Amino acid sequence: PHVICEPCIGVKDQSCVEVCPVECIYDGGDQFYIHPEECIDCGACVPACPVNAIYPEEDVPEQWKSYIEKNRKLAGL
Ligand code: SF4
């Protein structure tokens, strides 16, 4: 799955929402999040975010690893 990290907070641009083929990006309050069980890993959302907040799970920066679980918790997992 792909993960929305720190940069989204305080921005919530939402350009990512319009390019996701499965509509699995949801409002999580302080940031949007990607539902892990729905995401098909097509990667379309990556170039769409103006603040580079989205990363494939395997490539999430070491400093932002906590966002993997955050997206999971927001998804209710
Ligand atoms: S990787 Fe594809 S399916 Fe997953 S959130 Fe991004 S646009 Fe949607």
Ligand code: F3S
């Ligand atoms: S700011 Fe957040 S709402 Fe989408 S376009 Fe970037 S991950």
